[PDB]
Amino acid sequence: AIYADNSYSIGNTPLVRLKHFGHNGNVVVKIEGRNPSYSVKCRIGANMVWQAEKDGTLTKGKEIVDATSGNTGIALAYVAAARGYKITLTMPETMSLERKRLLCGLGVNLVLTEGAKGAKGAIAKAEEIVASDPSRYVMLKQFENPANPQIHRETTGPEIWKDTDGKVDVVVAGVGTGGSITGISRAIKLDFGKQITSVAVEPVESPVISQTLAGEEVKPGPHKIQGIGAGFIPKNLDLSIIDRVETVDSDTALATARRLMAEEGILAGISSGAAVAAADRLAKLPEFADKLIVVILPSASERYLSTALFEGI
Amino acid sequence: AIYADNSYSIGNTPLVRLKHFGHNGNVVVKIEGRNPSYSVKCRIGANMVWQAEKDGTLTKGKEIVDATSGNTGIALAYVAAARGYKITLTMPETMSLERKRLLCGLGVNLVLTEGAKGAKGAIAKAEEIVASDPSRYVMLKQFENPANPQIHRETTGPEIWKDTDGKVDVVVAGVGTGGSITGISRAIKLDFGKQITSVAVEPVESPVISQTLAGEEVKPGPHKIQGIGAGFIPKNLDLSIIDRVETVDSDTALATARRLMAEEGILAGISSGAAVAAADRLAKLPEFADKLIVVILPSASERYLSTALFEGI
């Protein structure tokens, strides 16, 4: 059909079988880089705006404010442009020129907060701007907004079900906001009624889901797997549908994304490498020999050209 | 379904209606950035390899050689990786570090030719490598290989026909190799039998198609619209199916791509801006008031972050 604006074109991303991972083709990847602003977040940028519209919280003239410069910021930016909203994104003055340019290109009002304050300083500023005129500004809050996992339950999940003809046995997804694994798992286990294994992936450097579930002291840590490992349990992560948590280290995630490019011809991002590394480990366990493992690849390689993904390559 | 490798996932790109161009929504764009290596060329990288396989010109152990660092080089790179071929790309030593990294990431053997020799020096070197052992090397030749327009006749064209329910009246496409407009036009005019208007787009700086058709001295010139305006009439441009040629200047192409980003939320590349600028001009002629104009957008914005598209933004 013909989409009325770019937000409506979200999803319908392809599944590609891996040849150099898994065992006898039991690992299949879902390419979320193929989306209107080239990541999985395009789905939630679209649906958080749509739902806010339906709820009356977003109206003509009101402006979006958020504190992200990552995939969600880019997603909200294209949606704001497509649907005629002003958007302000806050972020530390220390952000890359290339990302500022991308966001400025999409028409975003950039508010650069103090470098020394990092992400926290940006979050504060966004909240202070919203507090300045709550009748004018709306913060959509990707970590707790249920419209996030809801779009995955309505789109990403049913796409996996349909493209595998219901044969999917395992879903492997890195957890950032938790929306993907939550929505996908709700779709497949509840709407389609299949008792699959839902695998959350997190960095070994910041294994807060593993620590939580084990009743251990929660100890986040720095890592390089962009998009996952936020260092807390997000509200949009439904722990009740998680069957297994796999941890992956930053180096192996990076190495795996590079293997995806050079061995599979798949331009995967960093967290995509992490997710495939976790899935490859499961795929080589005899218990998963006859099981179809579907892996979310959240983003595309070119978004990481100034990162360690290509540094030294 | 589940694609056996990434090359099979080509195409099925969405159509999005423009709100700030055209008149009463008569301009619709086809997003070719949504492809396995993120450009229209993914289709021809796939099909030139497939056809060479079918023809017996490409076999296990033979290696691809070409002289491109652009979208076609990236396309051939992902296909070579996906299907297990070694690939050598030649290009001037003066190429960006970011593009070298991308290609190295995809597993390409880079051969850097002398800076002073430009594209010609790279073409020579590729030809010299092929000449060195013609039993080992294959050059697929995007400007003359009929597998290029053929994939557009089999995929891009029928996608436009189906997504518009046969209502497409005009196709607007920048000409690089000519494959897109040629294949699309053959599909719609010959296979589906509709007498549409096929519009080739070229830079006003290098208007060789316009000059040729007018019987004027052919005078190429430099421009910034990457991907089009090769400065000659390619063999894969079928002049017999071109109804109209529109010229667009580099500044307006750039400005238009920026308008696509900020006003439509569409992350278009430079040549996408050129194609929409040409289509917008036609769309505002009363003769095209009631006509559905479909525009090819060959690539995505992030591939141009170090270009004039974002410089000064």
Residue numbers in the entry:
A (entry chain X), B (entry chain X): 2 to 314
Please give sentences taken from the publication describing this entry.
O-acetyl serine sulfhydrylase (OASS), referred to as cysteine synthase (CS), synthesizes cysteine from O-acetyl serine (OAS) and sulfur in bacteria and plants. The inherent challenge for CS is to overcome 4 to 6 log-folds stronger affinity for its natural inhibitor, serine acetyltransferase (SAT), as compared with its affinity for substrate, OAS. Results show that CS uses a noncatalytic residue, M120, located 20 Å away from the reaction center, to discriminate in favor of substrate.
In the wild-type CS, side chain of M120 interacts with the main-chain amino group of S70 and main-chain carboxyl group of A69 of “TSGNT” loop at 3.8 Å and 3.7 Å, respectively. Mutation of M120 disrupts the interaction between S70 and A68 of the peptide loop and pushing the loop ∼3.8 Å further away to postbinding conformation. On-rate binding constants of mutants of HiM120A, HiM92A, and HiM120 AM92A are ∼286-fold, 80-fold, and 200-fold lower than that of HiCS wild-type.
